[PDB]
């Protein structure tokens, strides 16, 4: 019998809120990274942007205050922690990555706070640009591949 | 004068130990559930994970044995027994809950042994995922809200 | 591309056979050296004899012929090559040794052909006497310790 | 070339230990069954008790546990397997037997686990009572007769 304590805390004062999300039960549904349909072996880098579940556009984070707040954005490694989509039925995997800039250069490194700025009376967009490498080796099995990345807007 | 007996017992043989805790005086400090800063009325479900007081990551329970051991995890209802954080100065309360899975579905029911497995030469993590409902009604007073959940790793 | 030759040979004429073994798949299971149960720190030398997997007694090697053949017996150093039993889960080790005579004197030296005699119409026993030193220093972790010595009856 | 496997095992958890022994090299010296001096033809049954090599008294087996443990005791047939002492120089033999009770009735049958009990915080003695039949026929040659019985405390 090892009984222990867990201090719970919350500082209600002046915070920042994330728009574009829908409450899926008790977990914020931020959006979808839909690469679309594809064949077994694709030569072009498959690339799609996150579509917020609430509006359809990009996640719009706004802060509640008058001074420009600096908030951070961190995305995790997905269900299996290595950014791989898994086929619903078979065990095939599809490696992918999420970048922050339009040219697929600034990568959202696993469990890292990619910095962001936000001014009063404005909503800043969180570009989560997906990208998949060209698979010109083995044709992955037919079906639907999925993953659930947890995006962590933290301060 | 009602004098009575209390039998004390301890079976020293082959037990299981919880890592990630720090001994706060004579009580094991397991960690912190830090939701962060927030405004009076938040529309998004505030959500944070427990951070072990010893390492900063998740509580890592390991069992001192060779064969697999099935240990249980039970969390209580907090200081007031209804999972509410209380403002340090005023009497305002903030209802919350702790879940076990990443999607806020498998709730750690009050005083219930949520089962767990532990295997050869390994430390299993105890995910205590916090979650707070969207308060879009009354703005709670400014300040710090706290609670001390007692996590009970028992066999 | 380094292609090379491996000459395979077998002289079917008049050989010697080892009894008391059971074919585990494609590998001859000769027996078990069961020291039994023990505490963390034992003061007495733990000592047990090999029990053939086929009968339960000692390995009975018999030769096929009329003149007394001189066959040899060689035992290797175990899985890690230093005669140590390893805990199934943890990395603790238990040093041991196998002797040929009842008084733990004639050691089956690693990779050495301890000589043996065998006459016609008779089966000679191969005494593999195990012995473990008294550990009165550190208590090894609880669990099961194992090793697989490969006994090599060769001619 | 008949290569085979010998599984080695040891269960370090909660065992029983035998006191009164001295480690002769790598073999536990339990004691001596000294019948004493005698003439060629003795009419009285020669009778002596085992004297532990460590203390001089009876072998004291204690179990490292709290609850009672039922351990067994087995003695083998001696060097020649028929409980005969042999003269160091000549080939004369002296038949004997080891009993468990003081009245020479409960015989330690060859390779048999004579049961034994052991209790909380106590050392139980292992009475190995020797007994030799009255030789009133042929006078055995002068000299010293010996044998080495292997006592097997097993669980």
UniProtKB/TrEMBL annotation, chains A, B, C, D:
Residue ranges of domain Spore coat protein U/FanG in the record: 3-152
Report the Pfam families cross-referenced here. Answer: SCPU
**Which cysteines share a disulfide bond?**
16-63
Protein name, please?
Answer: Spore coat protein U/FanG domain-containing protein
């Amino acid at each position: 019998a090892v009984t222990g304590q867990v201090d719970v805390k919350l500082n209600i004062s002046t915070g920042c809120t994330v728009g574009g999300s829908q409450t899926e039960g008790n977990m914020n549904k931020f959006g979808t990274l839909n690469f679309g349909k594809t064949s077994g072996t694709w030569n072009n880098v498959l690339t799609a942007e996150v579509a917020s579940a609430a509006t359809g556009g990009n996640i719009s984070v706004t802060c509640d205050g008058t001074d420009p707040v600096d908030f951070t954005v961190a995305i995790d490694g997905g269900e299996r922690t290595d950014r791989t989509l898994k086929n619903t039925a078979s065990a095939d995997v599809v490696a992918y990555n999420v970048y922050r800039d339009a040219a697929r250069t600034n990568l959202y490194v696993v469990n890292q706070p990619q910095q962001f700025t936000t001014v009063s009376g404005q909503a800043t967009a969180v570009p989560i640009f997906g990208a998949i490498a060209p698979n010109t080796g083995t044709p992955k099995a037919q079906g639907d591949y999925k993953d659930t990345l947890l995006v962590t807007v933290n301060f």
